[PDB]
Design a protein around this ligand. Structure first.
Ligand SMILES: C[C@@H](C(=O)O)c1ccccc1
Ligand SMILES: [Ca+2]
Lengths: 206, 557
């Protein structure tokens, strides 16, 4: 059956989804995620979109604001709207599968609502592809691929030049924050290859 | 995060072994989620953070994959030129261009809502800080507009059946991530994936650039530039967030450096020590690296030289002999509280003192603070992440290397003083400090061990569980939040692939309304603790033979 989704859990509760098409496969995935980690995923959704204060109060306002200033929702949405039917099926299925479990949860909360929801005083709401996408954007791209301290760096370089003079100051910055260091142990050995690009290390943009 | 991939020339009783230990911090419930997908072109098993559609750690019976953060420099900052007369505009390519802007409202439980505006330019969103009537800074990511593509690339790579099909997906992943490959035939590979900017000539990527136009990126570098290797002569691929390749520049973070001192050497050493390794020995590398003090190996020689000519009764000399006899592998005493040996405490005190006398003394306040951490700092809950060699220590290491360092010592961190004298003075501080605390009989020193906490708040500091759900583990271990190993073509099995992982505390985070905790709420916690692991199933028959429950849904889109 093209509509059949089988879920089999192993000795550790780990789910294996069996389905025929893209949408049904990820529907199953979303379904088990909602069974296993609904509260964790609900709060994750909120962290990545900056809507924690809605449920936890004033101590999270600054946090919410910082989250929102660090991305552009409409751009994320446009990336989703440009997705092919097959790719969309991944995000839509996943969101739908979660929704299927969430509907069952809010229909019979006396036995299915994770205790944390009663404890924090709110109930779970449905998901859309945007939400699924932001889990990834907020916890992977923003946590691990969004690092820079250039402003602080220029501040440090500026102090070094004030203390040691211009030429020496530049030299000390290249000593505390080198661009490259040839003695750095590398995952790819020198025998294999090297990076062919050379960079300015004199702040020549000024 | 660490990773070692052992190829055919170095695998024993197998053709390839992959062992990944991604270091995300420790949380309850688990940071990653175990999942198997079978259909629509997928056939995979493994586990992945926040249940992303794409499994970051897993295999498909033909190839296996993993990741560690790359930390390449894929973000630059553009100093936009503003004008009081044109609020909301910035100067770009000769014209006053209108910034993108949006209104947001923070609704607040039991509080008053707050409304504010977020601003963006052609370079990226505007930063709140460092704002002036004339200037605002935009954060420019090489991956801007490629978020979804990276998410899909991570999903589609799961269907790859060889190096060519896999690198095709790797070229679409735009975040700065190290990707690793291994396959049933014993092939192994690595790609420092991501989008990287094609910068103008003269653009120092560690410092901001004007946003008026002349410094705009040319575009993005092509995939040909991304560091990669397939079946390296060494016969192995090891990484611990260290540099991918010779002459490859790191992230611009002032606290981040790829230099002579790198924790990855700890892994290279164990892989080179044995010509071939079995799956069990490759797994054992987790236990060993998770207990290895990372500073011993770097400063011991310096410590020996300085005390080599002192009398036997010199207490400075004796702290060094202590270190010399030590393997640097910390173990817990029977008490579950202290370490069997005092080496880390010694190095910590000595290093803290060295930095304050050297790097710290040469940097103008308040930047000096950036270089004073010894890398042993922690709270009673223990480290929130991995342990690493501190930025100051890395700089200090170039200094004690003398002429063997390729980094010109523009200023002498030792300020004219002989290195030995400064090393001795720091040993003197260490002895005074430590002997005053533990007494003069070193052999009975019971110094504090680091412990580990699976936190109830997620990485953002937002509760993802109730406080009481926090889990504790006596022994801190500098290892992955999860560890998975995939072994291809194991000679002692009936399968062409075997795989294991550990997802602690457990697969499930569910607690019923009455407080009844799921059967899979904490069944992997003790396993994590003792470097244990459970099997990951892939084939229909394996999953079926190990089934605990089954459920069938009938649904139409
Ligand atoms: C934890 C983080 C890292 O290595 O720093 C990471 C990011 C992306 C994939 C694996 C690990
Ligand atoms: Ca940069």
């Amino acid at each position: 059956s093209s509509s059949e989704i089988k879920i089999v859990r192993d000795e550790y509760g780990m789910p294996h989804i069996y389905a025929n098409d893209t949408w049904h496969l990820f529907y199953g995935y979303g379904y088990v995620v909602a069974q296993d980690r609904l509260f964790q995923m609900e709060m994750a959704r909120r962290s990545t979109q900056g809507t924690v204060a809605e449920v936890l109060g004033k101590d999270f306002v600054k946090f919410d604001k910082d989250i929102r200033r660090n991305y552009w929702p409409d751009a994320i949405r446009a990336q989703i709207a440009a997705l092919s039917p097959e790719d969309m099926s991944i995000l839509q299925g996943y969101a739908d599968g979660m929704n299927a479990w969430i509907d069952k949860v809010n229909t019979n909360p006396e036995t299915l609502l994770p205790k944390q929801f009663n404890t924090f005083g709110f109930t779970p709401k449905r998901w859309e592809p945007f939400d699924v996408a932001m889990i990834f954007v907020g916890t992977m791209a923003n946590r691990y691929s969004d690092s820079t301290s250039e402003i602080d760096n220029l501040a440090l370089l500026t102090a070094l030049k004030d203390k040691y003079g211009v030429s020496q100051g530049m030299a000390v910055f290249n000593q505390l924050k080198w661009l490259v260091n040839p003695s750095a142990p590398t995952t790819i050995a020198v025998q294999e290859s090297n990076y062919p690009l050379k960079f300015n290390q004199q702040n020549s943009q000024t | 995060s660490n990773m070692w991939v052992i190829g055919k020339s170095k695998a024993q009783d197998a053709k390839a072994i992959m062992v990944n230990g991604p270091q995300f911090g420790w949380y309850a419930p688990a940071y990653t989620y175990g999942i198997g997908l079978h259909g629509a072109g997928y056939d995979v098993t493994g586990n992945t953070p926040f249940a992303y559609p794409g499994l970051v750690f897993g295999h498909n019976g033909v190839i296996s994959w993993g990741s560690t953060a790359g930390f390449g420099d894929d973000v630059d900052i553009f100093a936009e030129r503003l004008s009081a007369e044109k609020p909301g505009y910035y100067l770009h390519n000769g014209k006053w261009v209108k910034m993108l802007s949006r209104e947001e409202t923070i609704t607040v439980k039991n509080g008053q809502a707050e409304t504010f505006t977020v601003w963006r330019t052609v370079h990226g969103n505007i930063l709140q800080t460092d704002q002036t009537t004339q200037t605002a800074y935009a954060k420019s990511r090489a991956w801007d507009g490629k978020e979804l593509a990276s998410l899909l690339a991570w999903t589609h790579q799961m269907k790859a059946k060889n190096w060519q099909e896999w690198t095709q997906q790797a070229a679409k992943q735009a975040l700065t991530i190290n990707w690793y490959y291994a396959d049933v035939n014993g092939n192994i590979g690595y790609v420092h994936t991501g989008a990287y900017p094609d910068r103008q000539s003269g653009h120092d990527p560690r410092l901001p650039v004007p946003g008026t136009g002349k410094w705009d990126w040319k575009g993005l570098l092509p995939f040909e530039m991304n560091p990669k290797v397939y079946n390296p002569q060494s016969g192995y691929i090891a990484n611990w967030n260290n540099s991918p390749q010779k002459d490859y520049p790191a992230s611009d973070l002032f606290a981040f450096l790829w230099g002579g001192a790198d924790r990855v050497t700890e892994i290279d050493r164990l892989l080179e020590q044995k010509p071939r390794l079995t799956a069990d020995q490759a797994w054992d590398v987790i236990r060993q690296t998770s207990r290895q003090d990372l500073n011993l190996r770097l400063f011991l020689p310096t410590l020996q030289a300085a005390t080599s000519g002192l009398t036997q009764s010199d207490p400075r000399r004796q702290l060094v002999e202590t270190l010399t006899r030590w393997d640097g592998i910390n173990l817990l005493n029977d008490d579950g509280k202290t370490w069997q040996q005092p080496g880390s405490a010694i190095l910590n005190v000595w290093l803290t003192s060295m930095l304050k006398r050297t790097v710290v003394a040469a940097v103008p306040m308040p930047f000096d603070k950036w270089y004073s951490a010894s890398g042993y700092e922690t709270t009673q809950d223990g480290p929130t992440g991995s342990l690493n060699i501190s930025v100051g220590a890395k700089i200090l290491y170039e200094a004690v290397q003398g002429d063997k360092s390729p980094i010109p010592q523009a200023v002498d961190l030792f300020a004219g003083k002989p290195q030995q004298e400064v090393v001795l003075a720091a040993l003197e501080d260490t002895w005074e400090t430590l002997s005053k605390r533990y007494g003069n009989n070193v052999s009975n020193w019971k110094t504090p061990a680091m412990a580990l906490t699976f936190r109830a708040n997620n990485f953002f500091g937002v509760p993802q569980a109730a406080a009481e759900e926090t889990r504790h583990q006596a022994e801190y271990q500098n290892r992955g939040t999860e560890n998975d190993m995939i072994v291809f073509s194991p000679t002692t099995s009936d399968r062409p692939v075997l795989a294991w992982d550990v997802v602690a505390p457990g697969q499930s985070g569910f607690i019923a309304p009455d407080g009844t905790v799921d059967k899979h709420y904490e069944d992997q916690l003790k396993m994590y603790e003792n470097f244990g692991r459970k099997s990951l199933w892939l084939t229909k028959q394996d999953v079926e033979a190990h089934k605990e429950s089954q459920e069938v849904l009938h649904v139409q889109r």
